[PDB]
Amino acid sequence: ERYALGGACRVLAGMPAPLGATALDGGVNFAVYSAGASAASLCLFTPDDLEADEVTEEVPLDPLFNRTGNVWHVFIEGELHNMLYGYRFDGMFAPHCGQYFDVSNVVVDPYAKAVISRGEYGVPGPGGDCWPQMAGMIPLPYSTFDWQGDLPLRYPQKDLVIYEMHLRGFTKHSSSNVEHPGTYIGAISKLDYLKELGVNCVELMPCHEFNELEYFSCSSKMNFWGYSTINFFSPMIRYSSGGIRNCGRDAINEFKTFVREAHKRGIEVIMDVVFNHTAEGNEKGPILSFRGIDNSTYYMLAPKGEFYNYSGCGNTFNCNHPVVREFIVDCLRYWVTEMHVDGFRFDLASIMTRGCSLWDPVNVYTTTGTPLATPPLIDMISNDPILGDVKLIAEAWDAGGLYQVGQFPHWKIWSEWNGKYRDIVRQFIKGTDGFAGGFAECLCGSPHLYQAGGRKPWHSINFVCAHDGFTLADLVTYNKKYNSSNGEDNRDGENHNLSWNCGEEGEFAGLSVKRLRKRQMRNFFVSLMVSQGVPMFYMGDEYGHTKGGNNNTYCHDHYVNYFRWDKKEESSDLQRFCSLMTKFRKQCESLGLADFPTAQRLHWHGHQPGKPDWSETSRFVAFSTKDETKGEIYVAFNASHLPAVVGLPERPGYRWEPLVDTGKPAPYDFLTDDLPDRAHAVHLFSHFLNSNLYPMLSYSSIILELQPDD
Amino acid sequence: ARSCYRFRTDDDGVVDVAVSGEDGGYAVSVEVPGTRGREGGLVLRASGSGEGVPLAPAAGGASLAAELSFDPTRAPFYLSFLLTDASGAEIRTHRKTSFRVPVGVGPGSPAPLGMSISGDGAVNFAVYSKNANAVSLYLYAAAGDEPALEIDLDPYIHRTGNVWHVSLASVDGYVSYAFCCGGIRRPLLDPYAKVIGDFVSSNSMRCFASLAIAPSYNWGRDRHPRLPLEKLVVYRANVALFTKDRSSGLPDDAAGTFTGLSAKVEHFRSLGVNAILLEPVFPFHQVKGPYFPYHFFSPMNLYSSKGLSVSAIKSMKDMVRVMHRNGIEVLLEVVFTHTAEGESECQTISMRGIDNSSYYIANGIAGCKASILNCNHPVTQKLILDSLRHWVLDFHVDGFCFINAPFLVRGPGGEYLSRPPLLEAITFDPVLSMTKIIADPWSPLDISNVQFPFPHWKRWAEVNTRFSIDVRKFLKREALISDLATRLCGSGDLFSTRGPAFSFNHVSRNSGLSLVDLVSFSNDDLLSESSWNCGEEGPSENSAVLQTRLRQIRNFLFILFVSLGVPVLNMGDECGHSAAGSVSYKDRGPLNWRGMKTTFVKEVTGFISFLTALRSRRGDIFQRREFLKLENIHWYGSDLCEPGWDDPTSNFLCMHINAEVDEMASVRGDLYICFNANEESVSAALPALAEGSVWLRLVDTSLAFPGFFATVQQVPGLSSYHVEAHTCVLFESKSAL
């Protein structure tokens, strides 16, 4: 007979599964894995006592009755949902053997669904404390969220247009005019704008719980992007308007509200996940969750016991260890089935293919970190009964030298961020010898990387710019990075950006340079929107967001990283062009294809029809494809510095009609029936269109449609 | 309880549906908000209905609502409808389909797999099937043969990924359920069912999952014995054959069940057995036998007194509790490499009909007629690990012996995997980290396993098949004494990094010849058995053949129990069980309890008890965690000379073992062991002893019962002893201090 909270609650043996805290039978069951611990204790906090750094109650765990195998467990009977919990472990302290057991640390359960540290973004704890004590939320016996009948959209992947968004930066600027700027609820007000832009899927930058003050003591910078995860089961509480109210329930419900509101408007949600390392760093870092439970299990360790650095962040998660495998699969399944997330994007995904140290001949009877052809974790994810039918995207490289673009172990299921597409398009559009054939291959979905292995064109995620590196506007303004505001003496950041400043460096230039820059942004968007594969572009690229030449802006909570709703209205022409081009892609049945295009549908042209130029000096690619809706379309890219008049394919009984021309001044860069001057503007080019000709500026693009003429 | 469904439309809109169980009819309400593209009202036509239900404004033109009602007694059905504006245009879903909504069943949840009951009493069903394009649920009433209720699952609402799920308000009036995959109307068994029905060969092979849940079992103060691996003595038994005969004394319909096994615990206690290894108890078909299982979560119903699944569960738990109360561990033989299903529709009962590609290896293996499981596929991995965790947590099982263990390293194509994932997952499962795992290379399939190093991680024990071959050859004057020396010391050539405790030694199992048949039958067809009939084939009346056979049986038992490792005894080898020279495990018969009063059974049981007690008393030699030091073992020949290691004519070996001195705390003597496999007597010399110390003889298998074992003559050091033909002797040095 044993009691815990002033004799009011009974303490029982409990069950070893499921891991974490679960509410049943008028109580909570606690279960946690620890192979190396010799003693364990459950610690409970009231919200007031957590602020004062005091444990309200301690329940020792008996090694006889409270331990099955390597799982410690206990049951408490009562009402505990207004309390927080943590663990205390005892054991060997030997950093040169990989053991970090210490009885004065209270660690957080890795399976906790909410972590309570601080309530407000950027504000430290009492005394300027940037790392106060953390504790986990204890669940309720029932659910408190109404999904209102939400059902999965299950869009085919070829129909997707992906919009990468930062949750806080989306509405943090004052010009958003939302009630709660920078929160999950604040972003709901702006989903109609995304719907009218033409996107149907949003990729969120890391929304797992992280410390934005993690290196605020040294230097003074924030951690804005959030690629340093503390708990994988929890949302970022300081992205919520409630804070720590109701012990994280309000934050969880706000995230669910955002997801439900996005699904109600026909928008899918893809989550960024960072499973390749942890905020605990190397041996000099803080002890929060994993190092205080099983360091040698959760991290990849060398013989002496120092941490491998394949992520370039301090440690490396031991992804292919069986316990870590179960943990990661459980986390992904939890997000899918409880938060209705439609898919995931994995950061530094090559780390998830490196081998575990358990297969060395010393342990059983090829060392740690050797890449594998069939990694068990990828096998478990691809063939999971639930996870096998969702969207899986891998960034197929890491910081340890691995580069697996086109050769990631896919099981014919996995998609990839195509960086070869990025490089080829960046080099071709700015004008460079020897990239016409690569450009034509990029336009077709890169069959040379995906067809042989049995994957489809839509497994390629095409992008020109991302959150890391230059924005679309800075791609045409700067020849080199300006990262001196980062405090690292311009050392950090990509050094080979493959950009061209269109003639002059900086935002102050002549009229012709600015005209050329606008042309080049339109050319980039046209190239993105007529390619086979899934197009993706970054938040604010649709109005020409600029970061001042800084191509690595991870440490600035500042308007350089905020969506400028005031500056968006000054650039309505580019936004209109992007919306119309996305609509055009949606309307054509020959643009997003389920299979690689054949030669009977797609024909390549040059300056003259039917004679493409694949020579090294060529800077001109043109094609025409048959469409079941529009009849036939014709696309041409002139990446040369010389204007040219091009001949159009001869189709007796028909004529070509102009639709897109990136050289023309707005709103005539895109022709719509809302324009009252459409017929007259078309008529003024009839003397060229009649004889199958079209004049092009340098660095321009055109799209034409075939229509009956009799 | 009401259910809600939100459908996206093909014109960028939302249709909201609610189904309420009105306090016995059903009401369906449809609400269409928003207005951009359609203005002049809508009519709800039931998927081409000539009639129509106009939608009326609800709160000022913001929403349009309609209501439909349905009379009771209607079995679960689907309502399908379309929307039309005042132009003729039709509004469909975003998948270009009519709006379809279930009436009478809920959507359900994808976890946990199988059948579960919520607090309110709702019954949830979930089953994985990637390849099936249509899944149906059948409910049966107490008899059934035809379904009382049939429910098709909507491919949109009743699926999450590749898991089909559905919820039911109540299953009152029903006792069983099954699944139908594809268009085939053959009812399949739930792979995750915990209670199953009767195996009925219809005119076919069908079994139904039960809708009842096992009642809570009160374990009491039950504790796992947690016996050390180096102190185990294992008895392998078949549940059916152990007590089936009339001579067992059990009441009828309780003989050959778990209760019959539990009723004979004093037999094991008197033998010195502290661990019992059961032959497979998973449900199976009588056509193929116990080594071809159908189901992985239930005991076989024929092993219970009442013949039902719940009775089997309670009986198995009772037997386990009785064993643990007596300090005896329970180990289970488990088959996870193949099933009892076939490559056609007539013999499909479960996984073959649900998802063939995931659960089974394509085309099987050449020269085989069994369904080989795809063990290293992640879904099968999950099923096997779930089964093991279920048995450990719910039945309090202490360990597992994996039949056909080498097959577990084969990949989907049949290739050999250098890093097999299922074995690694079993070894590092945190729940199972305290249970014993043993790998058995024997296979019931027609093909035979090839040999390779099994990955153990210093955790897996193995069944030592070389031990039996080498002991059999030595007693047949056909092996070098170096083989006997290797096997007596714990088989260091195979368990060097693990220790002698991981070697599970045996001289006879439930396949091949028994102990009695090993000294009675040797034809040219029994060459793979290394047997010697001692002069005459079959039963004999010659007085010398009988003496040689008795000596050989004593020698076999003695060599089994004085070696380093875990001794494993097969049921019936303590009482002269014989199978008339057959090597088929199916030819073994029920144990005969009548003969446990005669001379022979008494000698055998007393010798076994003496050997077990001696192993316990001298655990510093026989219950070690590490091999004996090379400085404490001396090998001798005929008269304290060098042994003939490479001469295949000296079938004689002596072993002198020096006791260690432990400074933690007592003087323990030495051991002298002699083995003579020759047909002629051999003179042996005893090693020189200390001052005032003598040799005390403990065993001489050529003597007469009682007396050939005694706990007796004293012999001074440097003396001479005459070792008879086919004789083994044991000495212990006692200080006359």
* Secondary structure in 3-state letters for A315-376: CCECCCCHHHHHHHHHHHHHHHHHHCCCEEEECCHHHHHECCHHHCCCCCCCCCCCECCCCH
Residue B716, chain A, CB below 8 Å: the answer is no
Residue B154 DSSP one-character state: P
SS3 assignment, position B487: helix
Q: Are A393 and B117 in contact (CB under 8 A)?
A: no
Determine the Cα–Cα distance for residues A314 and A379; give it in Å rounded to an integer. 27
Tell me the structure's resolution in angstroms, rounded to a single decimal: 2.4
Q: Are B210 and B193 in contact (CB under 8 A)?
A: yes
Determine the Cα–Cα distance for residues A319 and A340; give it in Å rounded to an integer. 24
Named by the residue before each, gaps in chain A exceeding 2.5 A from C to N are 365
Q: Are A13 and A74 in contact (CB under 8 A)?
A: yes
Residue of B nearest to A380 (CA): B378
Residue environment code for B425-457, b if the CB has 16+ CB neighbours within 10 A, otherwise e:
bbbbbbbbeebbbbbbbbbbbeeeeeeeebbbe
Q: Are A630 and A432 in contact (CB under 8 A)?
A: no
Say if the Cβ atoms of A148 and B377 lie within 8 Å. Answer: no
Residue of B nearest to A73 (CA): B431
Which residues of chain B neighbour A364 with C-beta distances below 8 Å? 455-457
Q: Is the peptide bond before B421 cis (omega within 30 degrees of 0)?
A: no
Residue B378 DSSP one-character state: H
Residue of A nearest to B455 (CA): A364
Which residues of chain B neighbour A373 with C-beta distances below 8 Å? none
Which residues of chain B neighbour A388 with C-beta distances below 8 Å? 130, 161-162
Task: Please enumerate in sequence order all residues whose Cβ is within 8 A of that of B678, keeping only pairs 6 or more positions apart, or say none.
Answer: B477, B651, B652, B725, B726
Determine the Cα–Cα distance for residues B403 and B390; give it in Å rounded to an integer. 19
Backbone angles phi, psi at B65, to 5 degrees: -130, 150
- Which amino acid type is present at position B176? S
Residue keyed to tokens 């896919």: A410
Provide the sign of the torsion angle of the four alpha carbons A216, A218, A221, A222, taken in this order: negative
C-alpha angle B404-B437-A17 in degrees, rounded to nearest 5: 115
SS3 assignment, position B612: helix
Say if the Cβ atoms of A389 and B161 lie within 8 Å. Answer: yes
- Which amino acid type is present at position A378? I
Looking at the annotation, which residues of A are catalytic? Answer: 347, 395
How many CA atoms lie less than 13 Å away from A673 in the CB half-sphere?
Answer: 0
Q: Are A72 and A85 in contact (CB under 8 A)?
A: no
Pick from A341, A469, A455: which is nearest to A407 by CA?
A455
Task: Please enumerate in sequence order all residues whose Cβ is within 8 A of that of B247, keeping only pairs 6 or more positions apart, or say none.
Answer: B592, B593, B594
Q: Is the peptide bond before A18 cis (omega within 30 degrees of 0)?
A: yes
**Best of B5, B6, B127, B379 to mutate (most A CBs within 10 Å, chain A):** B6
Q: How far apart are the first and last CA of chain B?
A: 88
* β-bridge pairing B53-54 and B43-45: antiparallel
Say if the Cβ atoms of B161 and A376 lie within 8 Å. Answer: no
Determine the Cα–Cα distance for residues B526 and B51; give it in Å rounded to an integer. 84
A–B: how many Cβ contacts below 8 A?
106
Residues of chain B numbered 392-451 and touching chain A (CB < 8 Å): 393, 419, 421, 424-425, 428-435
Residue of B nearest to A355 (CA): B419
**Best of A267, A353, A365 to mutate (most B CBs within 10 Å, chain B):** A365
- Which amino acid type is present at position B404? N
Question: Obtained via which technique?
Answer: cryo-EM
Residue B285 CB: number of other CB atoms within 10 A? Answer: 18
**Best of A151, A356, A411 to mutate (most B CBs within 10 Å, chain B):** A151
Residues of chain B numbered 370-389 and touching chain A (CB < 8 Å): 377-379, 389
Select the residue of A151, A153, A389 nearest B157 (Cβ to Cβ).
Answer: A151
Backbone angles phi, psi at A210, to 5 degrees: -150, 165
Say if the Cβ atoms of B16 and A364 lie within 8 Å. Answer: no
Select the residue of B156, B157, B432 nearest A69 (Cβ to Cβ).
Answer: B432
Q: Are B564 and B502 in contact (CB under 8 A)?
A: no
- Which amino acid type is present at position A155? Y
Determine the Cα–Cα distance for residues B403 and B624; give it in Å rounded to an integer. 27
* β-bridge pairing B503-505 and B566-570: parallel
Say if the Cβ atoms of B162 and A386 lie within 8 Å. Answer: yes
Determine the Cα–Cα distance for residues A589 and A572; give it in Å rounded to an integer. 28
Which residues of chain A neighbour B435 with C-beta distances below 8 Å? 69
Residue keyed to tokens 């939100």: B6
Q: Are A505 and A406 in contact (CB under 8 A)?
A: no
* B493 CB burial (10 A radius; 0-12, 13-18, 19+): exposed
Q: Are B167 and B106 in contact (CB under 8 A)?
A: yes
Residue B160, chain A, CB below 8 Å: the answer is yes
Determine the Cα–Cα distance for residues B728 and B723; give it in Å rounded to an integer. 8
Determine the Cα–Cα distance for residues A62 and A443; give it in Å rounded to an integer. 64
User: What is the four-CA torsion angle of A423, A537, A173, A167, rounded to 10 degrees?
Assistant: -110
SS3 assignment, position B87: coil
Say if the Cβ atoms of B430 and A364 lie within 8 Å. Answer: no
- Which amino acid type is present at position A593? L
Determine the Cα–Cα distance for residues B186 and B349; give it in Å rounded to an integer. 9
Which residues of chain A neighbour B5 with C-beta distances below 8 Å? 149, 151
Which residues of chain A neighbour B390 with C-beta distances below 8 Å? none
* β-bridge pairing B671-676 and B652-657: antiparallel
Pick from B107, B42, B34, B108: which is nearest to B81 by CA?
B42
Q: Which two tokens stand for residue A69?
A: 């195998």
Determine the Cα–Cα distance for residues A503 and B521; give it in Å rounded to an integer. 100
Select the residue of B94, B128, B431 nearest A68 (Cβ to Cβ).
Answer: B431
C-alpha angle A467-A470-A472 in degrees, rounded to nearest 5: 95
Say if the Cβ atoms of A380 and B163 lie within 8 Å. Answer: no
How close does chain B come to A255, measured CA to CA in Å?
19
Say if the Cβ atoms of A153 and B94 lie within 8 Å. Answer: yes
Residues of chain B numbered 525-584 and touching chain A (CB < 8 Å): none
3-state secondary structure A653-695: CEEEEEEEECCCCCCCCECCCCCCCHHHHHHCCHHHHCCCEEE
Residues of chain B numbered 636-695 and touching chain A (CB < 8 Å): none
Q: Which two tokens stand for residue B668?
A: 């323990």
Named by the residue before each, gaps in chain B exceeding 2.5 A from C to N are 23, 143, 203, 665, 711
